[PDB]
Amino acid sequence: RTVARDITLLECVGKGRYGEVWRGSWQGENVAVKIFSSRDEKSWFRETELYNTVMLRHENILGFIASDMTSRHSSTQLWLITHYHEMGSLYDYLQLTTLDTVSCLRIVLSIASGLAHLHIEIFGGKPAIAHRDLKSKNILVKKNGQCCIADLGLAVMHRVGTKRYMAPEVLDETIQVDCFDSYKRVDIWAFGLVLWEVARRMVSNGIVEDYKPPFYDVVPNDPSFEDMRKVVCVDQQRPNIPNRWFSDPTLTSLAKLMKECWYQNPSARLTALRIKKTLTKID
Ligand SMILES: COc1cc(-c2cncc(-c3ccc(C4CCN(C)CC4)cc3)c2C)cc(OC)c1OC
Ligand SMILES: COc1cc(-c2cncc(-c3ccc(C4CCN(C)CC4)cc3)c2C)cc(OC)c1OC
Ligand SMILES: COc1cc(-c2cncc(-c3ccc(C4CCN(C)CC4)cc3)c2C)cc(OC)c1OC
């Protein structure tokens, strides 16, 4: 039988130190193709090892299609092939759109749903998985208004994370590295930051905040590890909650939820399952 493997690369939709992502075509259908830099080969290996262990299938996890290694004259080419989400990342989307109550809740509940699926161990199933680099650039927007979580190149099953989103125990190097729940609690911190990024773009009483990344007002672009440790650990700053949120019941509830993802004590933070329940009861 014929095994059609040709993928037509059509449009570069992302370039970075990681390598590149392309819109491609296979058998008349869009796929996304991540081409890894030699610098980031371990991310391909880790995501490939995870998918060889457990074939994750969830509406709020970027859908796996293939991992490909191809021999070249003097190098190895590493591709990850996934579902293609034409609306692009949540980071991108929040810069060109404001949200209503229903669209804000649908976005954050879908992220919580993907994250709880990663975190939960299922017997007879899947191992528990922590993401370790959750951020708005690693979330894609789907046409149905839900999102999905992308990039399991740092994930751990039961490169460092993006510094702007690191939890205090990562920055002060007190994280209990031998304890898997520690990694879930680092994802919850990052989730709270993503919640804040999205909530800012929800309109209430004719008011909205401009898109900003977490800590935009207290650290530079490409903040150093020390820049982040001083803000998050030494001064114990957290993102600002604008007064206008407290006129809106949804943003008032979301502010409370963010606070419960940002405790200094990792053990005090909400679980992804509790976040899901809280979001289902909002509105
Ligand atoms: C190797 O490489 C790539 C392959 C493909 C691809 C193309 N046609 C058919 C297939 C196929 C799937 C599954 C079976 C099964 C059938 C039932 N039987 C009991 C076991 C075998 C056979 C064939 C594949 C996997 C696509 C690719 O890219 C999208 C590939 O490159 C990454
Ligand atoms: C990698 O990705 C894609 C692959 C394919 C594809 C191509 N040929 C054959 C298959 C296939 C057939 C049959 C079995 C099973 C069926 C029951 N039992 C007998 C076990 C074996 C498995 C697999 C597939 C799934 C299509 C896709 O899209 C339409 C893919 O997605 C881009
Ligand atoms: C974060 O991580 C990964 C993401 C993806 C991924 C999947 N669907 C769609 C995209 C995308 C498409 C289109 C735009 C633009 C282009 C058109 N217009 C000018 C604005 C919108 C942006 C982004 C991506 C980047 C794939 C990955 O691997 C294959 C990723 O890595 C795991």
Which ranges constitute the DSSP H helices of 179-243? Answer: 180-199, 225-229
Partners of 71 in the beta sheet?
Answer: 76
Look up tokens 């989400």; give the residue: 85
Please identify, among 55, 86, 117, the residue that sits at the C-terminal boundary of a domain: 86
The reply to whether 205 and 168 lie within a common domain is yes
| CA dihedral sign of residues 227, 228, 234, 236 | positive
The reply to whether 251 and 114 lie within a common domain is yes
Q: Report the first-to-last Cα separation within the chain, whole angstroms.
A: 54
What is the atom index within ligand 1 of the atom nearest the CA of 79?
32
Residues with Cβ within 8 Å of residue 69, at least 6 apart in sequence: 76, 77, 78
Residues with Cβ within 8 Å of residue 20, at least 6 apart in sequence: 12, 14, 34, 35
The answer to whether the CB of 93 falls within 8 A of the CB of 104 is no
Phi, psi for 238 (deg, rounded to 5): -135, 160
CA distances, 207 to each of 4, 121, 268, 270, 272 (Å): 52, 41, 32, 29, 29
Give the domain extent around 78. Answer: 1-86
The reply to whether 120 and 253 lie within a common domain is yes
CA dist 73 and 95 (Å) reads 42
**Could you count the other beta carbons within 10 Å of the beta carbon of residue 179?**
11
The answer to whether the CB of 121 falls within 8 A of the CB of 128 is yes
The answer to whether the CB of 21 falls within 8 A of the CB of 83 is no
The reply to whether 110 and 166 lie within a common domain is yes
Looking at residue 256, the DSSP 8-state letter turns out to be H
Please identify, among 86, 106, 133, the residue that sits at the C-terminal boundary of a domain: 86
The reply to whether 139 and 28 lie within a common domain is no
What is the atom index within ligand 1 of the atom nearest the CA of 67?
32
| Long-range contacts, 261-264 (Cβ 8 Å, 24+) | 261/188, 261/189, 261/191, 261/192, 261/195, 262/189, 262/192, 262/238, 264/168, 264/236
| CA dihedral sign of residues 163, 165, 171, 177 | negative
The answer to whether the CB of 247 falls within 8 A of the CB of 205 is yes
Both tokens assigned to 189: 């911190």
Q: Entry resolution in angstroms?
A: 1.3
| 48-62 as b/e: b if 16+ CB within 10 A | bebeeeeebeeebbb
Pocket probe mutation, ligand 3, options 82, 136, 146, 152, max atoms within 8 Å of Cβ: 82
Please identify, among 32, 62, 86, the residue that sits at the C-terminal boundary of a domain: 86
The answer to whether the CB of 83 falls within 8 A of the CB of 62 is yes
The reply to whether 105 and 171 lie within a common domain is yes
| Residue 164 Cα to ligand 3 middle (Å) | 21
Both tokens assigned to 254: 């979301």
The reply to whether 131 and 261 lie within a common domain is yes
The reply to whether 5 and 102 lie within a common domain is no
In the chain, how many domains are there?
2
CA dist 194 and 214 (Å) reads 8
| Long-range contacts, 18-21 (Cβ 8 Å, 24+) | 18/43, 18/153
Residues with Cβ within 8 Å of residue 24, at least 6 apart in sequence: 7, 8, 9, 10, 30, 31, 32, 33, 81, 84
Query: Which residue, among 124, 135, 152, 106, has the nearest Cα to 196 in the 3D structure?
Result: 135
Which ranges constitute the DSSP H helices of the chain? Answer: 41-53, 90-96, 101-119, 168-171, 180-199, 225-229, 249-259, 272-281
Angle at 86 between CA 36 and CA 46, to 5 degrees: 30
Both tokens assigned to 277: 């329940």
The reply to whether 127 and 79 lie within a common domain is no
Identify the three-state secondary structure at position 95: helix
The reply to whether 125 and 263 lie within a common domain is yes
The reply to whether 70 and 112 lie within a common domain is no
CA dist 188 and 220 (Å) reads 24
Identify the three-state secondary structure at position 185: helix
Pocket probe mutation, ligand 1, options 1, 2, 5, max atoms within 8 Å of Cβ: 5
Phi, psi for 271 (deg, rounded to 5): -85, 160
